[PDB]
Amino acid sequence: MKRLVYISKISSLEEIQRIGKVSIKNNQRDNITGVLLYLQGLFFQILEGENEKVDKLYKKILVDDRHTNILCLKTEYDITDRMFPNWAMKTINLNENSELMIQPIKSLLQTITQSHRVLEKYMPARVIYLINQGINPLTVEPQLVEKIIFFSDILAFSTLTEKLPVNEVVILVNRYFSICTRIISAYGGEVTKFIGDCVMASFTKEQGDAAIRTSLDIISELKQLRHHVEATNPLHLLYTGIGLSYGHVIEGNMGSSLKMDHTLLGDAVNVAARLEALTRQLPYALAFTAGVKKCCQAQWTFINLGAHQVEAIEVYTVNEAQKYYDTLQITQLIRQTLE
Amino acid sequence: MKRLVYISKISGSLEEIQRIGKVSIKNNQRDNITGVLLYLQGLFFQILEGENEKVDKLYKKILVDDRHTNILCLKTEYDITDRMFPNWAMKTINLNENSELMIQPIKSLLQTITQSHRVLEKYMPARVIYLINQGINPLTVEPQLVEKIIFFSDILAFSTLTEKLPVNEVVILVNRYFSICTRIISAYGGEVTKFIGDCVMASFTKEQGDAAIRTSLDIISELKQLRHHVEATNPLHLLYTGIGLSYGHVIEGNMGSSLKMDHTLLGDAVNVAARLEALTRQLPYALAFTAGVKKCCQAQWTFINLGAHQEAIEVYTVNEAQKYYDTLQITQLIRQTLE
Ligand SMILES: Cc1cc2nc3c(=O)[nH]c(=O)nc-3n(C[C@H](O)[C@H](O)[C@H](O)COP(=O)(O)O)c2cc1C
Ligand SMILES: Cc1cc2nc3c(=O)[nH]c(=O)nc-3n(C[C@H](O)[C@H](O)[C@H](O)COP(=O)(O)O)c2cc1C
Ligand SMILES: [Cl-]
Ligand SMILES: [Cl-]
Known part of the structure; x- marks a missing residue:
């Protein structure tokens, strides 16, 4: 009973x-x-x-x-x-x-x-x-688990914080978090934390394709939003880059009676973050590891972007994550728009 | 009434x-x-x-x-x-x-x-x-733009510790480290905001510049006492930290959607503090902070200029934060001990 x-x-x-x-x-x-x-x-x-x-x-x-x-x-x-x-x-x-x-x-x-x-x-x-x-x-007790780690953040966010009023920044960040959380959750992922403008999430090893689709849907919905709004709306300048890693992470509740949190411990978290940062200097808005690629069974057009140092590791993307823009021009355009 | x-x-x-x-x-x-x-x-x-x-x-x-x-x-x-x-x-x-x-x-x-x-x-x-x-x-x-000192601390060579230690040994070590950081941060009037992996993120007000430096020194000192309090079969014997402090404008408040809310700190200072903590790996000091932090200090520390690093930013530390060890040698020790 x-x-x-x-x-x-x-x-x-x-x-x-x-x-x-x-x-x-x-x-x-x-x-x-x-x-x-x-x-x-x-x-x-x-x-x-x-x-x-x-x-x-x-x-x-x-x-x-x-x-x-x-x-x-x-x-x-x-x-x-x-x-x-x-x-x-x-x-x-x-x-x-x-x-x-x-x-x-x-x-x-x-x-x-x-x-x-x-x-x-x-x-x-x-x-x-x-x-x-x-x-x-x-x-x-916390357990070691195999997970796909998701990291995304806002392009040129320091420029945006530098040049926008407080409420504008908050509205923009809230819209971004809203779109990320909704899509991540729709595909079975779970949001771990917001860290500044960064969204940290995790998928299971069986959810490789879902993680790729989440990444593509977030990018796609941002592009829609950018041409939905007038050019005086900060949302017209919201871009994102996304990193994905796969590895062993210890998942559980950590801390003391004074303070607790839920955390993921392991190298994959840092790799996902570095890969997300790497998309600034790449022609693609999504970068992931070989481990992520091996978790995918759909017929993606994987693109090898060589080895990079975060040891160096292989970095891949899918063809559909290619930027219809030049990144450096975008950040400069963001700067000039806010003049 | x-x-x-x-x-x-x-x-x-x-x-x-x-x-x-x-x-x-x-x-x-x-x-x-x-x-x-x-x-x-x-x-x-x-x-x-x-x-x-x-x-x-x-x-x-x-x-x-x-x-x-x-x-x-x-x-x-x-x-x-x-x-x-x-x-x-x-x-x-x-x-x-x-x-x-x-x-x-x-x-x-x-x-x-x-x-x-x-x-x-x-x-x-x-x-x-x-x-x-x-x-x-x-x-x-409602969110507010405020001047904060941002605190980041994490565990040295944590990637090696996760690779070579059992899950339960890693959890006991991370809990103790979180327990020690939270107690000291809180004792000095700081606010722990969240745990990210093995990292502790906290904020101090602009009036608590010395309290943040004292917090950092106290955590380092307490880890040193613990390393020689325990046997060499105890993972706590290998627990070291690096600490980064930044100062700047950050937006503080509730952010997110109906799906997920959180208390977040948005601002350039959050990223800077994280990078400075990572920078301590390649410094003969376990603490690194920006110039704005140094200007928040009224006590008479021996500030040491470690030049500019990556627009470049100027980095400082206190003579008190010097390591009695070479960091590369300590990393090699951590791996050799675990064999
Ligand atoms: C707050 C709340 C509490 C309920 N508690 C019970 C309950 O304790 N036992 C029960 O059989 N049904 C409970 N119900 C709802 C009924 O199960 C449901 O409306 C009905 O049984 C549907 O019948 P059906 O099985 O033929 O579809 C509760 C509904 C609400 C909103
Ligand atoms: C749960 C709890 C509730 C209390 N509530 C009151 C209270 O409502 N009013 C009050 O004067 N003291 C209350 N006290 C205790 C006060 O501190 C009390 O005044 C003290 O023990 C003795 O005060 P004195 O040294 O001035 O005589 C409470 C203590 C506890 C543990
Ligand atoms: Cl899937
Ligand atoms: Cl985490």
Whole structure:
């Protein structure tokens, strides 16, 4: 038996009662007990029952359109007892509870949960996934894994920061991060960090083609954006270069009780970064290693760009990543445009 | 009138908890402070309301109390119209001793969300924790151009250490290095912003020039003590660092999309500090910084000019940062030891 807890965000009061009625019916049939609280636009649900049976329900609740931003906070895998043996699904509306002695607990709960939701927006997606799976991020051991590492950043970003107002730079950076995160995630990748204007992400060794396609789609969407906007919009000057590496990296949660983070340790991270920087002096906006190339099964036109020093290593690209522009001219054009 | 909420962990008894309750009633009666103290599973929740001078005066007293630790103020309300608890000088509730069944769901939800909250706090940038502690929602703060000293430190010959050490040995070594850097940076008023691979990124204000140099020297010194504290079979015996400091304008604030948010620092100084840390590999000093950092220093260091490096930039260090070893020889030692 196992018991899990999740919180969610509500997307009218009668419909909630309908939910509760359905749950009472469905859960008694499956020996599932639990509770549904709601307060100030948030849902709280505890569910317990047979391991297989709770999972089917949770999948239904996940795809349910009535709530969004679902996060499973805790899972307990071999519970000796149930917490609510008699409740198929007790609905408790903490909004219309006016009892004074419950008001401090209720107020603290709302404050702490809202604060928790704010913090969730800064978490690495890999930690959120771990928590959703019932794994303690603080105790899980890091592992060596084979990964494709993705690095991209904004062309001539120092020139742009030098010549643009604060809000313009932030709007531009936010648009860039938005387009990178959306495309990376669409292809199954995971964004690791933003470092300045750099986007760091990782794909699995089975996602070589997806990484190439992510890189091409980001470049392609930037080119569209550049001719979507007027020439007074800074977005008209947004270009990117992309580096990809493949290797062994130690993935996990690192640090101390004072400060934690999710990190990838290994040479491939630095190689991807150097390759991304190398695209400035290349006729292509995407550079990757032989290891990345070997993870690809599609019929790309790989182009060998010789050995370069980051030891020297072979550097490849695909034909479709070729620049329709000259890079040095572009940075000068950016400089002159901002005069 | 001011109302604030905070949570804390108990350091290190029912009669002692009730003694806290009685002292608070007396003092709060004196200063027209009302509120609620709540205890649950080694955790403290307290709500305090009153006029500004008195609640701050009490809060400073509460921070220094040795009975609780890891104090975080979650919300602050200013010039409030009403009191939330007009009639309670200090109502102490021990939810551990509450056996009521109807309260058990809310009590369980509070414990779970608070414990998850404390875990999430560890992953936050120190600037976000700071903003929350000031009763400011970090998500509503607008980015600002500010003058910052940027700090970068990483592990020497880390590529060799990852290649030749087991995963668990690498993790113990990186955790200890992160543990040491975070403690010292934080002790000196610096803010750790994130870990990138084996690198620690932090920022200091322009008024903390000496504190940043002292932070760097202290980390180096503590690594030196540790290297001779341990046996030669311990990976910690081979742990060295290089440190880079830069000074310049950076944009600070929340950036990204609905898919991924983060606290980022945008600016030329971020890249410069990273390159200077890497530059220490080929210098007889473990610390390298720009001229702007040197101008932020009021203490009488022996600054040493290491010329210009790559537009070129001028590099400085302090005589105190000199290595008692040759760096190439130390790298060869690291590889020869691991055979
Ligand atoms: C917040 C929330 C909690 C829910 N909890 C339960 C639950 O505990 N048990 C249950 O059977 N259904 C629950 N539901 C939704 C129903 O599973 C779903 O609407 C219905 O069962 C679909 O019926 P079907 O299986 O015939 O498609 C919940 C929905 C929401 C939005
Ligand atoms: C969790 C916790 C909550 C506390 N709350 C209050 C409080 O609300 N009011 C108060 O005067 N002291 C509170 N105290 C303790 C104060 O520091 C107290 O005034 C101190 O222990 C004794 O003060 P005194 O030396 O001036 O007599 C609290 C302590 C703890 C650990
Ligand atoms: Cl693929
Ligand atoms: Cl990382």
